[PDB]
């Protein structure tokens, strides 16, 4: 699969290649090390690419603007405030067959991240050993692919993404445990995005393009309007934004931020407001 590829804006557990059950963990306001996977936001890392440098910032999800930082000239690594220092940039490059990634420092490309015997971390020169190979696993894919889910608007604790009765239109509605409010999330490799299938009629969350821009359940299609990028809110791993693949500046949006049963769900320009923020949970 290509679901765990090093796409920009995506969020990952970063593991040693020798153990998928240990992951990179912001332990203190400064210290990082490999740790048993428990999935708090301290163990989730967002990639922020820099096309000019062809390198990435690796940013922890729990703290505003702390990014993985080489403490030059020392051999240690920490998380520190983002100041766009060259020592805070990393080439991430993948072996296609093993899936292993080398995490190489931008400031000094002789040096690469390595995991020590006691699972602490450091930068060091590259030697063949497996102590410099990491696996990246996309958090959302690993949590949500092939799962039956419900989607709650952040506007209100009991208003959910719902196919309307005897219509194709999708609206907000309070929970009544209906198959109309149940959505199976499936990744598609050709689109590098997800479809969401209503359990009631086995049809898909789709942007219907006209003056109203309603989302509706629609038959299976290869058109981009049926595909969604599911990502965490910019600085919050409890909340999600869903971009439509037809136009990745547009997102799943509650019309006029109304909360009333039956309020239309639409596709609208991104602003990051509460009406474009969703809580996704397994049923
Ligand atoms: C999301 C959804 O399907 N809502 C439907 C509700 C619920 O089925 C009902 O509240 C169950 O308690 O019923 C209606 O109001 C109705 O019967 O006229 C139509 C509406 O589309
Ligand atoms: C608002 C936002 O994120 N826009 C970005 C989208 C989304 O990240 C994507 O729809 C969700 O994965 O990705 C890009 O198209 C990309 O990564 O090349 C860049 C674009 O600026």
Swiss-Prot record:
1-alpha repeats: from-to residues: 1-52
Protein name as annotated: Main hemagglutinin component type C
Region spans: Sugar-binding site 2: 253-276
Result of changing residue 268 to F: No binding of N-acetyl-beta-neuraminic acid, increased binding to N-acetyl-D-galactosamine and galactose
Subunit structure: Botulinum toxins are produced as progenitor toxins of large molecular sizes of 12S (M toxin) and 16S (L toxin). M toxin consists of a non-toxic, non-hemagglutinin component (NTNHA) and the neurotoxin. L toxin consists of the M toxin and the 3 subcomponents of hemagglutinin (HA). HA is composed of subcomponents of 70, 33, and 17 kDa. The 70 kDa subcomponent undergoes proteolytic processing and is split into HA-55 (also called HA-53 and HA3b) and HA-22-23 (also called HA3a). The stoichiometry of the whole complex has been modeled as one BoNT/C, one NTNHA, three HA-70, six HA-33 and three HA-17.
Gene this protein is translated from: HA-33
Note: This protein can also be encoded on a prophage.
1-beta repeat feature ranges: 53-97
Annotated SUPFAM superfamilies: Ricin B-like lectins
Organism (species): Clostridium botulinum C phage (Clostridium botulinum C bacteriophage)
Disulfide bonds: none
